[PDB]
DNA sequence: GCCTATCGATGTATATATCTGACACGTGCCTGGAGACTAGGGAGTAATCCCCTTGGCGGTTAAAACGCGGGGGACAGCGCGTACGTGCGTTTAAGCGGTGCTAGAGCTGTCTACGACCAATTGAGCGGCCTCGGCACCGGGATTCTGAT
DNA sequence: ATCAGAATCCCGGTGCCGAGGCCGCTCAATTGGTCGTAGACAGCTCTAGCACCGCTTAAACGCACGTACGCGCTGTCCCCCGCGTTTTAACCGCCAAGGGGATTACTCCCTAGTCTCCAGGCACGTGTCAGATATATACATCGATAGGC
């Protein structure tokens, strides 16, 4: 368990995050605890999106998450759609939505 | 004979295309248009196979959102047809000019 | 050439959340871009916050407050919790 | 006939059924007839902005080829971040 | 004598588009700011300039929203602005979910 | 005290916006919109203040929060 | 001073220092601050010229936030540049729709 | 007390250049200072991102030129670019 | 004037069958992360000064609030006629396979000017303090809008 | 088209405090020197972007007809608007605590920086399984028909 990610209990890297912070000119002295926190946050968000997209894949009888499933997961959820609202997912399409005025009677 | 009515086929088209990820503008004409829009800014310019595809994806995403706004402006005025006034309003409120 | 990506880490997270579900190369290319974008947003907010307080360091706290500012309410409240867990049991060892 | 062709202006190459298809993906039931030459102008203006920014990106790096990263950067400079095509 | 419905309204529009003052009253807005803030952290002091800046931003935002609302009202061939107009204007801007 | 934003004040705000005639239901909608706006802009000012070990919300915090939401304010400290 | 050497009134040295303490890049070139100061001076001159013209049209001899707002909103390019800015104590440009006016 | 800096004198010299007899109020002074700061940070962040994009670590005049071309509008990015090039040229001419 | 049986007209969804192309997994390698250690300054601490926000009082005015009449606009209904949808047959060009070339991306290696740091020096620039002229105002006339004659 | 008559313009006197100078001072910019990485510059490889033709085939185009949606008109109504009147609290002027922001100096630990060492991480090459894609089913959506009720 020599890796910092092992001590942090995260799958996302901590050394890579620290290197990116240092070489990104974000500040002149990156703290030792910042990479762990940021890696944990990114892992949390990735897990949230992936778990929401896999449910859509299951509902569509698919064993592979394609961009459609990611689009459905992000746009359906209110918080993710708020964070990723003004962002385009390539080959994601649009949410099915037809409005009451247009439907026939 | 069998004759569908104004708006009956349209709804099936909406359902079909809203369920698909396909790129609804054909690629070659859009590529040509991209190159000639790029040629006023700089001549002797080449494009990768993926740059034009990214441009097209962004373009139809923008246009689809704009048409959603245009339909909603049309319904605002007690209409089902989307008209150029609707697009102009839907682009004025968003600040684009 | 030599290129780096987050793909393997996203795939391990996938195996945790959904051990039986796979992912395509395009979905992975989208998830990697998502991770990078969120990284840049949080890091830039933290850097600006350090600049405001005449500081010169990005600590775990500045990341916490950038998370609070950026992420929505419920996502922010869960992300701060799990990040605090990670940092506290990292510093324990 | 076996002389030549019209050489259509290619902003017309974005044909009427293509614009109609885009509208139908947008949830539009009925469409006017004057909204095609307006959609063409809107699309053209959008492309001019994005392509000008991406050609500035390309020129700064001293390259003759417009990379996908240039397009992504140009879009992200305008609050239109594109996921999946680089970055 | 009396003025017809609308003329003094035009006079007020020509009057208030010509000035640069702050239209909302200062003290009620101050109280609103503090009661909103208390929900996040208890007993927060405020610099006078902080509330002044908040008021200026709020008035600017509300005036721009009312401009968009008026455009929406004119779209429907009406001179009255209605809550649906504000809803449409905030939505198109993306401010409303 | 959201009712403190009086009907004549909203009317003046509408007149400066070019509005000529206002429905009677506009006022509550405007008050709600203003409350959401203020909540959004103060939840960030209070965070910028909490991170600083300050109990006073300075004009700089408000300016930073407003700039963060795409609303740059000139003349109040920036 | 580099400001006189560059033929500018804006401070080249302070622009260099701010580019240096802002973490913008690890290294800052010699010509970057001069160019940035020149551009800033040009933009300031443009805004001040238009604002002073507006003040003269209003007979005011001192530019005030209202004149700055009028100058910025009357010029298309400056309005695009300052499009999401809210100049304090600036007001709104006079504009009433044709429909509202009586027939 | 503290020691604060502002772009208040240089703006006041530019004002004398454009309008020799016109003045500026304190609120307008602060507004112009905020404008200068905002433009500075915009054109510096754009240059920093451009340097990062090309695996670059130095912010030189070329990055500032291209950032002024990306950020500023069409006609306002021409006179500004010419002025910057002139300033750089005459600075490098003199020692 | 229903709306309810019912047609045969098309569309969608669901069923099993066989491919491929792209997705997992493994192998070898190397470049980046981990583990030592150092010096040094950035952040935390306590302590002091003093601005500055808070709450209180009183007065006075303006503004907000409530009530009224009425007229102008929102809204429902109706009719007309042109535009848009839908289907047919015919024609055009996109899509994908070729062909061939070569410009240009991307890598290494070189090396030398530009810049990063330090130290000593000096004057630009900031604040203290001061003053004089301009603008907000106040009230008085003329003026231009107007409002029913 | 016309008047009287509210409501902004126009003008002169007043006068208050903020903008515009002038000074003392310090700390930040400038000059001079040195050193080291970094970046323009030459060179070479070969990836992939450029044009074209060939061939298929589904989308696009052109045209006809019919229906329904848009737009103008009319009429009713109610709900806003503009004015008067009474009520409320915002504004301001002043004084006064005292809590908290900003400084100061001291001090210790955290982070950059260096070196060594090796194991995590992806390129490359791979086998096979999810999914594209079918055409078959079987079953709905939908005028159109014409029956009583």
Numbering used by the authors:
A (entry chain G): 14 to 118
B (entry chain A): 38 to 134
C (entry chain H): 29 to 121
D (entry chain B): 16 to 102
E (entry chain E): 39 to 135
F (entry chain F): 25 to 102
G (entry chain C): 16 to 118
H (entry chain D): 28 to 122
How is this structure described in the published paper?
To investigate how the human chromatin remodeller CHD4 engages a nucleosome, we determined the structure of H. sapiens CHD4 bound to a Xenopus laevis nucleosome core particle in the presence of the ATP analogue AMP-PNP. To determine the structure of the nucleosome-CHD4 complex, we collected single particle cryo-EM data on a Titan Krios (FEI) microscope equipped with a K2 direct electron detector (Gatan). We obtained a cryo-EM reconstruction of the nucleosome-CHD4 complex at an overall resolution of 3.1 Å (FSC 0.143 criterion). The CHD4 ATPase motor binds the nucleosome at SHL +2. The ATPase motor is in a closed, post-translocated state with AMP-PNP bound in the active site. The double chromodomain is located at SHL +1 and contacts the nucleosomal DNA phosphate backbone via electrostatic interactions, in a fashion similar to that observed for S. cerevisiae Chd1. The PHD finger 2 of CHD4 is located near SHL +0.5 and the double chromodomain. The high resolution of the nucleosome-CHD4 structure shows that ~5 DNA base pairs between SHL +1.5 and SHL +2.5 are pulled away from the octamer surface by up to 3 Å. In contrast, the DNA distortion observed in our AMP-PNP-bound state is an intermediate between the bulged and the canonical DNA conformation. In contrast to the nucleosome-Chd1 structure, we did not observe unwrapping of nucleosomal DNA from the histone octamer on the second DNA gyre at SHL −6 and −7. The basic side chain of the H4 histone tail residue Arg17 inserts into this acidic cavity.
CHD4, CHD3, and CHD5 form CHD subfamily II, which differs in domain architecture from subfamily I. CHD3, CHD4, and CHD5 contain two N-terminal plant homeodomain (PHD) zinc finger domains, a DNA-interacting double chromodomain, and the ATPase motor. CHD4 is a subunit of the multi-subunit Nucleosome Remodeling Deacetylase (NuRD) complex. CHD4 is implicated in the repression of lineage-specific genes during differentiation and is required for the establishment and maintenance of more compacted chromatin structures. Here, we provide the 3.1 Å resolution cryo-EM structure of human CHD4 engaged with a nucleosome and the 4.0 Å resolution structure of a nucleosome-CHD42 complex that contains two molecules of CHD4.
